[PDB]
Structure formats: C-alpha cells, structure tokens
Amino acid sequence: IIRRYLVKQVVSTSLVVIALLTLIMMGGRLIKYFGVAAQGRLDAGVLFSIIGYRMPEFLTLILPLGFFIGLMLVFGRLYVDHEMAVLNGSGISRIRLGQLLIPLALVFLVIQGILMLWMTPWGLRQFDQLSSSQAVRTGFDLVRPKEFISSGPYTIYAGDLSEDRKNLKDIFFYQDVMILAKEATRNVVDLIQGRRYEIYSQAEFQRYRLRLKVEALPSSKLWNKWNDPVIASEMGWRVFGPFTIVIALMMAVALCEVSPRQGRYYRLIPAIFIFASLIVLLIAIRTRISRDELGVWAYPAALAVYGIAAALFSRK
Amino acid sequence: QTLCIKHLAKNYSKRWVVKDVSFEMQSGQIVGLLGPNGAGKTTSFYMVVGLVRMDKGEIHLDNLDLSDLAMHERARKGIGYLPQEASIFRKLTIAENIMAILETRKDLNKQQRQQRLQELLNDFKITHIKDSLGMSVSGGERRRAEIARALAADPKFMLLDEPFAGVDPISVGDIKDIIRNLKDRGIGVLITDHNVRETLAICEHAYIVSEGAVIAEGSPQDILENEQVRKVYLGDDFT
Amino acid sequence: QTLCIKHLAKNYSKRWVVKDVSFEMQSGQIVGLLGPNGAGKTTSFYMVVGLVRMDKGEIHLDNLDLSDLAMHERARKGIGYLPQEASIFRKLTIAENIMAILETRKDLNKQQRQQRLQELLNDFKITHIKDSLGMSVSGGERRRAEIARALAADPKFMLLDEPFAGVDPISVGDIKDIIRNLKDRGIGVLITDHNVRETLAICEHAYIVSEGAVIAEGSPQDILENEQVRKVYLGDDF
Amino acid sequence: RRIVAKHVTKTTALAMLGTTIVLVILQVLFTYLGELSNLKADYSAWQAFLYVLWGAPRYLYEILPISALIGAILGLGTLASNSELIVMRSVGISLWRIVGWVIRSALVLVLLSFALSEWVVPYTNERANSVKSEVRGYWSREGQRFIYVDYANSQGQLKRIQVVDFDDNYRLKSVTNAEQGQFVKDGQWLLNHSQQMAILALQPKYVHMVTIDPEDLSFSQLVSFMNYMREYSQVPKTYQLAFWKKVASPFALITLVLVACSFIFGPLRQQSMGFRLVIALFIGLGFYYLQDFLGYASLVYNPSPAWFVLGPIVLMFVAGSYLLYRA
Ligand SMILES: CCCCCCCCCCCC(=O)O[C@@H](CCCCCCCCC)CC(=O)O[C@@H]1[C@@H](NC(=O)C[C@H](CCCCCCC)OC(=O)C[C@H](O)CCCCCCC)[C@H](OC[C@H]2O[C@H](OP(=O)(O)O)[C@H](NC(=O)C[C@@H](CCCCCCCC)OC(=O)CCCCCC)[C@@H](OC(=O)C[C@H](O)CCCCC)[C@@H]2O)O[C@H](CO[C@]2(C(=O)O)C[C@@H](O[C@]3(C(=O)O)C[C@@H](O)[C@@H](O)[C@@H]([C@H](O)CO)O3)[C@@H](O[C@]3(C(=O)O)C[C@@H](O[C@@H]4O[C@H](C(=O)O)[C@@H](O)[C@H](O)[C@H]4NC(C)=O)[C@@H](O)[C@@H]([C@H](O)CO)O3)[C@@H]([C@H](O)CO)O2)[C@H]1OP(=O)(O)O
Ligand SMILES: CCCCCCCCCCCCO[C@@H]1O[C@H](CO)[C@@H](O[C@H]2O[C@H](CO)[C@@H](O)[C@H](O)[C@H]2O)[C@H](O)[C@H]1O
C-alpha cells in the first residue's frame, strides 16, 4: 500500500512538474521562434511544427529533471507533513522508499530510452529537414516594414506590412533593375500599381508578376561504428543518457531531508543545481568525445561518480 | 525490557542545549520527560527518538546499543514515535493508514494482517471511518488513527511528543485513557509536553530537565514535593 | 469605552466555522474568548483583530463602526494585537523596537518620545537589554519587549493571542501580572488561549465559543458552573 | 515614522542586492558554460571569459527587474515569517506604506538600471563585441529619395554613394553616384566624381548606431536616432518597440516589486521561504516571457508597441493593487 501510495504521488507530481517545465522551457524557445518569425526569418505558420518536432528533444531533458523535482517534492511533503517520521518510526527508511520506487524509476528509464534512442533522433531529423526548408527563404519573405532588407543582389524596402507577411505597401525593390510599386502581394510576388526602371529603361504597369547531422541519425544506423568519435559520442549519449533517471532517483532520495519549517520547496534549488551540474557535465563529456578526446568510458564514469556521491550522502 | 539512556549531550552553535541527560524507562511504564521550555527536554526527547543526532550519549534497549543506529533501525528494534503534528497519511484512508504499516510486518501474513487491522480499528473505535481519507477526519479521530497505525508496527516503547497539545480539557481524559492503554499492552510510553499538570497525572516516573541537565527523578508526587523543580519550573504555587 | 462585537460569521470552503459570535468588552476588562479548539474562538478573535475579514458581522468601538476598516485602520482606532509567535523585529534592538512604534505616534514629540521610551523600558524591566537585538533575547524578555512595543502605540484594547503558550508554570504568574497591568492602565485585554485553566484565573468576563456560536457568558465562576460548557468543552471534572 | 521605514527599506534593499549579486554570478557562470562550447583557435577559454565578463553589465540590466522581484519576495518573506509585518499592521502602518518603503528600496535598483543603460551597457557591449571579434552597404530613404552608400564612417566619409530621387508620381528624376565623400555641415556633403543623371541628410554621428540593434542602444542614443529618422525618414516599428521597452523598464520594475509585495501580503502569506522563492522565480519567468512575447507581437500586429509594452505593466499594477486591497 505504501509503495502504490508513493508511486501515485510521485507520478502525479512528476506529471505536473513535467507539464510545467515543458510549458516553461518550450514556450521560452517558442517565444524566440516567434521573434524570429516577426523579424521575417521564419514562417509564422510552421513554428508549431517546430514545436512538435522538438518535443522529444526537450522532453529528453524534462523527463529526468521532472522526475527529480517530483521525487524531491514528494519526499519534502513526506518530511514536512511528518509522514516520514512515522514511516521512519515504523522501520521504513528513506532508502527503503527509494528502493520501493525502483520500478517507477525503471519505467521512466524505459520511457527516456524510447525518447533518446528513437523519438529524439526522429524529431531532430524532421526539425533539420524543416529548418533546411526554412533556411532557403529569401527576397520578399524577409522584408520588414519601413526597413531595407538586403538578401544577395536584392535590396527591398516596404512602407507597410499586414499581420501576415503579405499585402506589402510602398515597395522599393533593387537589383540594375529598380521596381517601385504601391502595392504587392506575395518567390512569386504580384505587384500592383508599379514602375520598373533599369540602370535607362522605364516600364509602367498596373500589375506585374515577379520571380526573383549525427544528432538526428537513426540509432539503427549508429549502433555499429563505435570507432568514429562522433558516432561513439552520440551512441554513448543515447545509451547512457536514460540512466540519468536512476541517478535522479538516488539523488533525490539523498538530497530530500528537509525540516517541516523550511518547507517542501526549500532544498529544490540547490538540488536542481546539482542535477543540472550533472547534465552539464554529461553535455561537456559528449562534446569532448565528439572531439575525440575523452572516449565513451566517461559516460558510465560520469553517471557512477554522481551515483556514488548520492549514495554516500543518503547513507551518512 | 528497559530503555536505558545516559549522558545525553547536544550543542547548537557551540551552545550546549543538553548536558548529561540520563534517564531509564521500562516496558509498561508511562515516563514523563518534562522541564522548563527550551531547557533540553524537547531536544533530549528528539535524540531519544532519533531525529537529532547525539553529540555525546548512550542509548540502550535491553543491553542492545542503539546510539549508532538510525531512527528507522531504532524503530525496527521496538521503538515507536508519535509526532505532535498531524502525521496521518493525507491521501490514504484510515484502514489503509494502518494497513500500510501492517504490511511491513515480517511476522504477519495477509490472513492475520487483515484480522490485526480489523481489531486495531475496533480497539480505537475508528471502524466507522475506515474508508475515509486521513484529511477528512476530526482531530481526535485522526489522533486515534495515528496511534493505531503506530501500534500496527508493534513497538515496545512508544515515544509520544506533546500528546496533550491543543486539546480540550474534555478530550484530555480521552488521551489519558489512550496512553494508559499503551501501557496496558506493555508499550512503555515516554511523554514530553508543555502541559505538565495533566501529564503528571498518568506518569509513573517523571524526569525534569533544566538547562540541559536532569534535576529531578521519581514519581509525580516526588516532583511536586521537590524544592528545585518548584524553584525553576513549577513555581511556588502549583495545583 | 466599550468594544462591541455582534453577529460575527465566517466560512471556509462553504463550511461556517463561525456562526453568530457576539460579545462585548470594555476598556479596563480582561475578557477571555475561550472554547474548544477549532470551534471558532480563534477565527472570531482574528476577525476582531482584523487578520481575516468577516463575512457577516458588526464591530463597534464607542459607537464607531470598525467592520469596514482594515487591520491597520482598526489599530489606529485603538486596538492592539500581540501575536503568539515571536513578533519582535529581529534586527532592531529592544529600545529601537519600542522607539520604532513610538515614532508612529502623532501626539508625541521626540523630547517626550524619549521619556516615554525610557519609562516603557523601565516599566517592563527591559532596560538592561535596550541595546540588544530582538533576535538575541530570552523568551520572557522578548515577550515583554513585544508588549512594551504594543503599548508604545497607546492601544485602548489589547488583544492577546495565546499569552500562556509555551510558558512554564512558574512564568505563568509573570504573564498574569503583566496582563493585569495592561488592565491597570485602562487597556481592555481580550485573551484567546487553549490553556483555559490559567486564562480563567485573570479574566473578569469569559466567553465560550462552541461550533461557531457563543454558548456562555459571565464570570469564570459562572463558566465553570455552566452545563453546556463542561458538557462540550471543560468535561465533567475540571 | 523612520525606524520602521529604515528597517524595512534596509532589509528589502539588502535582499535585492544579494539577489542581484547571486543572479549576476549565476548568469555569468551559465553564459560562460554556454560559450565554452564555441571555442576555436582565436577564441580561447580566456577570451570567452572576457567576453562574458564584458557582457556582465548587460546581464545585470536584464536581471534588475527579476532581481527586484525576488528581492522584495525574500525580504518581505523574512519580515512576514518573523511576524514583523503583522505587528506593523497591528500598530497602525498600512499595507500601502510598507509597499512604499519597498518601492523606495527598489528605487536604488531603478537608478542602477538607469546608470547601466546610459553609461555602462553601451560601452561594455562594445568591449564584449570587440573581444569576441562603420557600416557597409547602408541603404536609407529620405522622403522620396533613396540613398545607398557602400561604406560610411563616424569620421564623416562616404564611399560608392548612390542617391536616387523621386516625386509623388514615383518617377525617376536624378540618379547621382560618387566614389568618395566628405561631411562638412548638416544637409550638404562634398564629394568627387559627381555623376548626376538628368531625366543629403546623412549624419556621421548616427552611423555607428545603424549596426547596433535597437534593444542594445542606450536611451539617449535611441532617442537621438529615432529623432533623426522622424526628422528625415520613417522610424521602424522595432525602434519604437525598443524605445517603449526602455521607457517602461523602471515602471516595470516598480510594478513587479508592487506585485511581489501584494503576493507576500496575499497568496504567499504564511508560506515557506522556499515556496516564496519558487513562486518568485515563476513570476519572473512569466513576466520576462510575457514582455518578450508582447514585444515580438508588437512588431507583427497593427497596434503601437506602447500598448503591448504597457499592457503587462498596467495589468500587473492593477492586480497588485487589488491584492493589496484584499489585505
Ligand atoms: C542526459 C539527460 C538530459 C540531457 C539534456 C541535454 C540537453 C537537452 C536540450 C533540449 C533542447 C534544447 O536545446 O533546449 C533549449 C536549451 C535548454 C537550456 C540548456 C539546458 C542544458 C542542460 C542543463 C540544465 C533550447 C536552446 O538550446 O536554445 C538555444 C538558445 N539558448 C537559450 O535561450 C538559453 C536559455 C537557457 C538557460 C539555461 C540556464 C538556466 C537554467 C538552468 O533559454 C532557453 O534555453 C529557453 C528557455 O527560456 C529556458 C527556460 C529554462 C527554465 C528552467 C527551469 C528549471 C540560444 O540563445 C542565444 C542566447 O540568447 C539570449 O541572449 P541574446 O541573444 O539576447 O544576447 C540568451 N539570454 C537571455 O535571453 C537572457 C535571459 C535568459 C533566458 C530566459 C530566462 C531563463 C531563466 C532560466 C532559469 O535571462 C534574463 O533575461 C535574466 C534572467 C531572467 C529569468 C530569471 C529567473 C542567452 O542565454 C544566456 O546567455 C544564458 C542564460 O542567460 C542563463 C540563464 C540564467 C538565469 C539566472 C542565449 O545564449 O540560441 C540557440 C540558437 O541560437 C542561434 C542558432 O544556432 O540558431 C545562434 C545564436 O548565435 C550565437 C548566440 O547568440 O548564442 C552567437 C554566434 O556567434 C554563435 O556563437 C552561435 C552558436 O554558438 C553557434 O556557433 O550563438 C543566434 O544567432 C544570430 C542572431 O540573429 O541572434 C545570428 C548570428 O549570426 C550567424 O551565426 C551563425 C552561427 O554561429 O550559428 C554563424 O555561422 C554565422 O557566420 C553568423 N553570421 C553573421 C553575419 O554573424 C549572430 O549574429 C548571433 C548573435 O548572438 C547576435 O544575435 O545571432 C540565434 C538566433 O537569435 C535565433 O535564435 O540562433 C538555441 O539553440 P537551438 O535553437 O539550437 O535550440
Ligand atoms: C560540473 C561542471 C560545472 C557545473 C556547474 C553548475 C551547473 C549548473 C547548471 C548550469 C546550467 C547552464 O546551462 C547552460 O545554459 C546555456 C545557456 O547559455 C545553454 O546554452 C544554450 O545557449 C547557447 C548560447 O549560444 C547555445 O550556443 C547552446 O547551444 C544552448 O544550449 C547550455 O547548453 C547549458 O549548458
């Protein structure tokens, strides 16, 4: 009963924390994407596709962090509500609770293994294809109102622009061919009430038509080729990455002893910093192996150092 | 069985809150760890429970040392703890509250675990709320459920923290009746409380801790006729 | 001067914790607002203080309505509050603690503010700790400093929250002597406390609130001989 | 009242300054960690550290609203958990008076923000850019004239000028070109090889601001540069957004401090210090995200950026005032 009670609490609070962290981080990135779109360097109608495709990559970090924060919240609530005093007072240690939640740790490890091995590379490759499709936009796609946009041999000025990047007003186009149009709608662009000049030729018109990665590779294609440092780094990251769930379990068991007065959220920030330090160390090791300087052996070493530290802290 | 504690000591920022607290309690005894507020009775009780690690001290339970043991190991050795605050599991029902601790008993199987849970519910008259959550019960019912859950662990020494805290005088009698049951089942009961006058009414052997040291020992009558307890703790007049 | 409270009411998640609590207190009286724990005595006391706003109620202070006023406005009208917790300013000395509230007085100039601070320090025997920070004083000294600080505002009704909480039986006499000097200064004192037995020893007029309603009224002798009070609150033997 | 006011102001100011120092240290460390993956032959670890340190004043300027929010939360939580605000109310000090004391404390951070924006950030940003590493191909319009220069300097010289004139009918009038140019007075520039076809208001003080993004521009530089456009051209919406974001920064800080005070007196009353800090971090992230998103939306939507910038501030001030009214 105690095991299912703890599993229910941790699953509920970890789902809440994962949803909250997804909202926070993924919306913070979506706001940067929206700013890029407002600057004309990205389509406003495809940013949601980027959100969908980068969901596995963000969840790859949110799931261990969310599980760690949820474990901290549950254990801090147990300590604050004096439910840990009666659990300890009944012979049930905190390490006993950590061992009881081992099956949930394995479930989350399987989920994050699914994310890292399959879902994250698929999302990354879809997002890379989308970015390559969105890195070729040029011309009137990048225009901004009351500004001059230079893209290759084209200099473009627009006096006004709608909410969407269509229906331009006060258009000045430069090549040498000069085209000045009162209106223009979008590269295929239909200009309205414009004048064409060549530098000397002049042509007036009422209307005119103008016509100016290893992180994403499949795990099946990277299971072999351990000799390549980049492939070795990526596969070690995809294989030893999911064990951060288990590290988070034994770390949130270690760093959750809080008094009722301090509160449930008192020890979150230092422990979140410790977990983020572990993840930053993992990223640095990934880069180092990609540079052929550290080797795959550093991933289990990095996980084991933090695991041993957490075990020693929990058994002091 | 006896719980022998001797030479307790603890400092807070190089300030010795507890200095040489020694007291003995046996199974089937209601021993009161009393004293002036902040004089070390609470800290001594907490180190006895295991919530505050001792700086200098020796705790024994029938020639079995518990000084190095953690709180859960001491509990496995036969020591129970009842927190003053609401220690009931909020999202578990009262029957589930008792059964969660009952399922940890290695000498009880499910067939007799159910019988133990039923008789624990019937003993404390909490059967009518066996299907109700721990947050949706009254203070007295919640405390009875907590005590039943603590008894489900089968402790040899139940350490009560402020049992008469925030309780009406009408229910002080009910708490006294409960804590006299805990001594009818053999469970030695160690009580620390600010409400000393009603604590001394059930204690068989009282200890007064002043400025970190034990200054009295004996029956409540001996405490009430002491010339130092009434000089530092109980005052000149005390009914 | 009287503090009239009538028909207090308050609910928590559609659960009426307080239902028609009415009691009157005069300047110079030590009135006890007692009752079983969680029965509405604490909520009624807080509504009188102004910490929790009343859903339905009427509070008067010498034919002056205080129902719509906030906590600070009621305090300016002449109501004092002594929190049960350690409410002293941690980083301000005891003399600074009293002077901080003395400076808020509009009828006192600095020349006589200094004299008032000196006589308040001398009154409560806290002159020896006038230069010591509020976080580095004993419990009794801190409580005396808090009471002096509250008196520095010159209240007409001092509302004490659990004055006999976490106090030794020897030190209960000191608290009783203090609460009797707040009444010997003309400061009506309203006391809510779980420790009813030492509360009834000083109160001139006690009120018992059970299940959100007042069930008793009169002197502590009248309270101790009330069938309902000892049937729901005090018990058969007390 | 002075001792209560001094105590509250000092405690809150110490909280804001400590939070400011902690957040600046954390954002310097995090920025250095993020930059450590961008090292090359000419950009070593020391170069990255120098770039991060030179960008520290800009990070501080960005933190000061959130720093003030968290500092107000922490200071008023220290007072409230010690029941100092309860007795402050119980002696006759209103909630709005305590809020005014906290606002007085945050005025120091407002002045620090002004100083950083005017005199520190514009120079340290240039230093950071120099450590990591005056406009070429400058295209400008002056009324009905389009001016293109391939190279301009702050000293007042032009290379490869190309000015095209027009009328209300958008008809070619004169397309003059040049190879070199010089600046002598406003509204006239001496130049050689004046090849004028038959069928200038550029200023060298504002040349160096063309490459600088509108957000990075100081308030003095931004105001002067927008005035230069409004006198000679049409100001872009991004410059208006930057101006409205800079003029509403102290107001945003004050409103966020007021929101922190209202939360302490309201929803965050009787809560843990850790919970108060977590809620303060959440409010800071929400405010930063909301202001960034509305600044971006002001550049894509018809209404002026003033609405999108002063919307969150006014609404947060109203919410804080209402929470203070609820006591
Ligand atoms: C094992 C199990 C687990 C595994 C887990 C593994 C990991 C999982 C992974 C999952 C997936 C993932 O990753 O998910 C996240 C990551 C999650 C976090 C990490 C987790 C790790 C694990 C441990 C936990 C997404 C990500 O990673 O996104 C980065 C993005 N990063 C950030 O945004 C950082 C912070 C994350 C903070 C983490 C630390 C704190 C939490 C622990 O936010 C977020 O993540 C979003 C969200 O809110 C987070 C919420 C967290 C909540 C946590 C709650 C618990 C990045 O942003 C760029 C910069 O943005 C801001 O600064 P400014 O910009 O305004 O100056 C950022 N500051 C701010 O906002 C200020 C904000 C911070 C943010 C908001 C608050 C957060 C608070 C959190 C608590 O604080 C404040 O207000 C004060 C505080 C307020 C809050 C208080 C509570 C900068 O942050 C900082 O400094 C650090 C922060 O302060 C720390 C916070 C400290 C708080 C105390 C940022 O570095 O932009 C990147 C792309 O960017 C590019 C691109 O590549 O496409 C490149 C850009 O160029 C630069 C660069 O500028 O970086 C310069 C280049 O020279 C070069 O070096 C180049 C490159 O080096 C490559 O070389 O980088 C830029 O490019 C352009 C431009 O024009 O501008 C053209 C450039 O020109 C061309 O460039 C080419 C090139 O090089 O490409 C060259 O080839 C060409 O020749 C060149 N041609 C010419 C002509 O020049 C150049 O002109 C350039 C220039 O800069 C000028 O603009 O500009 C950009 C473009 O803008 C479009 O975006 O594009 C994104 O990556 P992706 O998209 O790939 O995802
Ligand atoms: C053990 C080593 C020391 C550990 C120290 C303690 C660490 C505590 C948590 C540190 C978290 C900072 O997290 C760091 O955030 C930065 C924000 O600039 C992220 O950086 C992000 O923005 C930069 C800016 O260009 C991008 O280039 C990068 O691709 C992106 O990830 C880093 O990827 C991440 O490592």
Residues of C in Cβ contact (< 8 Å) with B196: 169
CB C148 within 8 A of CB B213: no
Of A251, A285, A284, nearest in space to A270 by CA: A251
Beta strand D145-152 with D135-142 is antiparallel
**Residue for token digits 């405490």?**
B223
DSSP state of D297: H
> The tokens 């505050």 sit on which residue?
B52
Cα of A287 to ligand 2 centre, how many Å? Answer: 13
Q: Which of B73, B235, B80, B225 is nearest to B157 (CA)?
A: B80
- Going by alpha carbons, the residue nearest to atom 34 of ligand 2 is D34
Contacts of D199 in chain A (CB under 8 A): 200
B139 touches chain C (CB under 8 A): yes
Contact A96 B72 (CB under 8 A): yes
Considering only the beta carbons, identify the residue of B70, B87, B91 that sits closest to A82. B87
Q: Which token pair is C215?
A: 């069930």
Give the number of A-B residue pairs with CB atoms closer than 8 Å.
Answer: 78
Q: Are residues A149 and A285 in the same domain?
A: no
Q: How far is Cα B32 from Cα B160, in angstroms, rounded to an integer?
A: 10
**Phi, psi dihedral angles at A99 (to 5 degrees):** -70, -35
Residues A94, A258: contact at Cβ < 8 Å? no
Query: Does one domain contain both A198 and A243?
Result: no
Across the interface, which of D2, D7, D92 has its CB nearest the CB of C75?
D92
SS3 B234: coil
Contact A288, A298 (CB under 8 A): yes
Same domain, A89 and A127: yes
> How many C-beta atoms surround the C-beta of residue A304 within 10 A?
12
Phi-psi region of B26 (alpha: psi -120 to 50; beta: other; left: phi over 0): beta
Chain C within 8 Å of B111 (Cβ-Cβ)?
A: no
Task: Give the burial class of A211: count Cβ atoms within 10 A of its Cβ; 0-12 exposed, 13-18 middle, 19 or more buried.
Answer: exposed
Which amino acid is present at B104? T
Specify whether the CB–CB gap between A44 and A161 falls below 8 A: no
How many other CB atoms are found less than 10 A from the CB of residue D32? Answer: 15
Query: 3-state DSSP helix/strand/coil percent for chain C, to nearest 5?
Result: 35, 25, 35
Q: Which of B72, B84, B67 is nearest to B3 (CA)?
A: B67
| Pairing of β D175-177 and β A189-198 | unpaired
**CATH superfamily of the B1-78+155-239 domain:** P-loop containing nucleotide triphosphate hydrolases (3.40.50.300)
Of A153, A185, A210, the one marking the end of a domain is A210
The whole-angstrom distance between D21's CA and the closest CA on chain A is: 17
Structurally, chain A folds into a number of domains equal to 2
List the end-to-end C-alpha distance of chain B, in Å, as a whole number: 34
For residue D63, CA distances in Å to A28, B175, D109 come to 16, 55, 10
The DSSP secondary structure of D3-45, one letter per residue, reads HHHHHHHHHHHHHHHHHHHHHHHHHHHHHHHHHGGG--SSS-H
Cα distance from N-terminal residue to C-terminal residue, chain C: 34
Q: Are residues A244 and A290 in the same domain?
A: yes
Resolution (A): 3.1
Nearest-by-CA chain B residue for A82: B87
Alpha carbon A84 to its chain centroid, in Å, reads: 36
Query: Which residue's entry shows tokens 């977990």?
Result: A275
CB contact under 8 A, D146 and A157: yes
Domain containing A302: what range? Answer: 2-135+215-314
Count of CA atoms in the C-beta half-sphere (13 A) of C55: 14
- Alpha-carbon torsion, ordered B135, B136, B142, B145, to 10 deg: -90
Interface test with D, best of A172, A191, A196, A281 (most D CBs within 10 A): A172
Q: Residue C179 belongs to what H/E stretch?
A: helix C169-183
Encoded amino acid at A95, one letter: I
Q: At which residue do the structure tokens 């070429």 appear? A: D136
Q: Reduced to 3 states, what is the DSSP secondary structure of residue B146?
A: helix
In angstroms, the CA B159 to CA B147 distance is: 11
Asked if B89 is an interface residue toward chain A (Cβ–Cβ < 8 A), one would say: yes
Whether the CB of C108 is below 8 Å from some CB of chain B: the reply is no
For B81, the 3-state DSSP assignment is strand
CA–CA gap between residue A68 and residue A58 (Å, rounded): 16
The verdict on D274 touching C (C-beta cutoff 8 Å) is no
**Across the interface, do B72 and A88 touch by the CB < 8 Å criterion?**
yes
Other Cβ atoms within 10 Å of B109 Cβ, number: 9
The Cα A289–Cα A287 span in angstroms is: 5
CA-D30 nearest atom, ligand 2: 12
Q: What is the CA radius of gyration of chain D?
A: 25
Give CA–CA dist D47/D133, Å, rounded: 10
Please compute Rg for chain B using Cα positions. 18
User: Which of C37, C168, C173 lies nearest to residue B167, judging by beta carbons?
Assistant: C37
Instruction: Check CB contact of B234 with chain C, cutoff 8 Å.
Output: yes
Three-state SS letters, chain A: CHHHHHHHHHHHHHHHHHHHHHHHHHHHHHHHHHHHHHCCCCCCCCHHHHHHHCHHHHHHHHHHHHHHHHHHHHHHHHHHCCHHHHHHCCCCCHHHHHHHCHHHHHHHHHHHHHHHHHHHHHHHHHHHHHHHHHCCCCHHHHCCECEEEEECCEEEEEEECCCCCCCEEEEEEECCEEEEEEEEECCCEEEEEEEEEECCEEEEEEEEEECCCHHHCCCCCCCCCCCCHHHHHHHHHHHHCCCHHHHHHHHHHHCCCCCCCCCCCCCHHHHHHHHHHHHHHHHHHHHHHHCCCCCCCHHHHHHHHHHHHHHHHHCC
Neighbours of chain D (3+ CB pairs under 8 A): A, C
Give the Cα separation of C74 and C67 in Å (integer): 9
Ligand found nearest the CA of A305: 2
- C161: helix, strand or coil: strand
Q: What single letter denotes the amino acid at residue C195?
A: N
Show the tokens assigned to A67. Answer: 């599980």
Let me know if B18 is exposed, middle or buried by CB neighbors in 10 A (0-12, 13-18, 19+).
Answer: buried
Cα–Cα distance, A248 to A279 (Å, whole number): 11
Question: Can you give the C-alpha Rg of chain A in angstroms?
Answer: 27
Residue B165 tokens read as 């805290």
The amino acid at D87:
V
| Contact assessment for residue C204 and residue C44, using Cβ atoms and an 8 Å cutoff | no
Kindly give, in sequence order, each residue whose CB lies less than 8 Å from that of residue D286, ignoring residues fewer than 6 positions away. Answer: none
- Distance (angstroms) between ligand 2 centre and the Cα of D48 equals 13
Q: Which ligand is located closest to the Cα atom of residue D27?
A: 1
* Residues facing residue A156 across a β-bridge: A173
Which residues on chain C are in Cβ contact (under 8 Å) with B12? none
In CATH terms, C1-78+155-238 corresponds, of 3.40.50.300, 3.40.50.150, 3.30.230.10, 3.40.50.10490, to 3.40.50.300
Sheet strand arrangement including B213-218:
B79-82, B157-161, B188-192, B30-34, B205-210, B213-218
Tell me which long-range contacts C228-233 makes (C-beta under 8 A, separation of at least 24): C230/B170, C232/B170, C232/C36, C233/B168, C233/B169, C233/B170, C233/C34, C233/C35, C233/C36, C233/C196, C233/C208
Within 8 A of C172 by CB-CB distance, chain B residues are 235
**A79 CA to centre of own chain:** 33
Among D30, D52, D58, which residue has the most ligand 2 atoms within 8 Å of its CB, making it the best to mutate?
Answer: D30
What Cα–Cα distance (Å) separates residue A153 from each residue in A176, B90, C71, D136? 9, 70, 71, 15
Residue A20, CA distances (Å) to A14, A16, A65 in order: 10, 6, 11
* B-chain residue closest to C168, CA distance: B36
Neighbours of A61 (CB within 10 A): 18
- The finding on whether D33 has its CB within 6 A of some atom of ligand 2 is yes
Cβ–Cβ under 8 Å, residues B25 and B31: yes
First to last CA, chain D: 21
Q: What is the DSSP letter of D309?
A: H
**Cα–chain center distance at C191:** 5
Q: To test ligand 2's pocket by mutation, which of D28, D33, D39 has the most ligand atoms within 8 angstroms of CB?
A: D33
What are the residues whose beta carbons fall under 8 Å from the beta carbon of D93, sequence distance 6 or more?
Answer: C72, C104, D1, D4
B98 CB burial (10 A radius; 0-12, 13-18, 19+): buried
Burial class, D289, CB count within 10 angstroms (exposed 0-12 / middle 13-18 / buried 19+): middle
The two tokens of residue A26 are 């993924």
Q: From A17, A21, A23, A25, give the residue whose CB has the most ligand 1 atoms within 8 Å, as the site to mutate.
A: A25
Q: What residues have CB less than 8 Å from D89, skipping those under 6 apart?
A: C50, C70, C71, C72, C75, D95
- Closest of D77, D120, D117, D106 to residue D252, by C-alpha: D106
Tell me whether residues A86 and B86 touch, CB distance under 8 A. Answer: no
Label the pairing between strands B2-11 and A201-210. unpaired
The label of the residue with tokens 């401090």 reads: D257
In angstroms, what is the span from residue D207 Cα to ligand 1's centroid? Answer: 29
CA separation, residue A259 to residues A5, A88, B198 (Å):
22, 14, 29
Dihedral, CA of residue A294, residue A297, residue A299 and residue A301, to nearest 10: -110
| Alpha carbon distance, N-terminus to C-terminus of chain A | 28
Contacts (Cβ under 8 Å, ≥6 apart) of A82: A260, B83, B85, B86, B87
Is the distance from CB of A231 to CB of A223 less than 8 angstroms? no
Q: What is the DSSP string of D180-207?
A: EEEEEETTEEEEES-EE-------SSTT
Q: Domains of chain D: which residue ranges?
A: 3-133+243-325, 135-205
Residue B169 has its nearest CB partner, among C168, C170, C234, at C234
Alpha helix (H) residue ranges in chain D: 3-35, 45-54, 56-81, 84-90, 95-115, 121-132, 208-211, 219-232, 237-247, 249-265, 273-298, 305-325
Tokens of D208: 């160096």
- What are the domain boundaries of chain C? 1-78+155-238, 88-153
- DSSP 8-state class, residue C23: E
Residue of B nearest to A259 (CA): B51
| Structure tokens given for A256 | 């959750």
Q: How was this structure determined?
A: cryo-EM
Residue minimizing CA distance to atom 17 of ligand 2: D34
